[PDB]
A = this chain, B = another copy of it.
Amino acid sequence: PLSPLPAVARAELDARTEREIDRARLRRADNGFFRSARDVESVSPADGHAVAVWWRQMTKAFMFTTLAGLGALARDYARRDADRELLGAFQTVYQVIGDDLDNAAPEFSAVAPTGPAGIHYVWWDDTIVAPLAAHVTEADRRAAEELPAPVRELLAAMDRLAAEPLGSAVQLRVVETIALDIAVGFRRVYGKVLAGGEPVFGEKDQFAWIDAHIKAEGMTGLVTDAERGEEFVRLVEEYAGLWSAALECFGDRLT
């Protein structure tokens, strides 16, 4: 009869994880991506396009490997009797993934393309990558798809967490924290990409994907014993560090 840790023990896990995120240099003030997105004067199409391709692959992998992690947990709950407080947290994960896979929240369903075109990595590909690709060469496009080492390392960690029953809680706990600052950074960068001196993105609804996200924006509820709690913090530490290294790679390329 599986149950979550007592509340006060879960509050401690929340504080420890909020500290690891601090420690990983992911806050609006500490990560170079959020800073460069604000500081830099203009962005070349090739630089903006490369970051857009990297993000497409990162968010694709985030969605699918978080769903896989939820499935790993589902496999366990098929063979145990999770109590209703655990089941509620399990439902939350399913609901949150539904933003990226099916535009669940009204902030998304009103504006997103329907069907598969609305899946968030596809919607990003169609509305950010594609208009930038017209301003770059095929050789550039192929180069952008050879992902840099910090992005590759984060994707490798997502593949490992795809098999971990704690994996979806780890990924959503970290990503939900930094999501809004990422979205605001993108709103800024792609307003500053210029081609014939002129902005590539110059209408309102070319930012639909980004603005829907800024509008739109407990996981420890799935920890069932103190040991799994320790594993949760260990995994958050690894994953938060890899996310930070990947976002600094964004900042470096934008300069």
Contacts and interface: CB of A to CB of B under 8 A. Distances in A.
A77 B91 CA distance: 22
Given A71-B67, A98-B94, A84 B116 contact: yes
Interface string A171-182: 000000000000
B84 A91 contact: no
Contacts of A88: 115-116
A175 B61 CA distance: 30
Nearest to A118: B91
Given A64-B77, A65-B78, A78-B158, A91 B115 contact: yes
Nearest to A80: B64
Interface in A60-76: 60-61, 63-65, 67-72, 74-75
What 3 A-B pairs come out closest when comparing CB atoms? A71-B71, A64-B78, A87-B116
Count of chain copies: 2
Interface string A79-122: 10000110110110011011001100000000000011101001
A159 interface: yes
A64 B75 contact: yes
7 contacts: A67-B70, A70-B71, A79-B159, A85-B116, A87-B122, A88-B115, A91-B101
A162 interface: yes
A99 to B, nearest CB: 12
A51 to B, nearest CB: 20
A64 B97 CA distance: 16
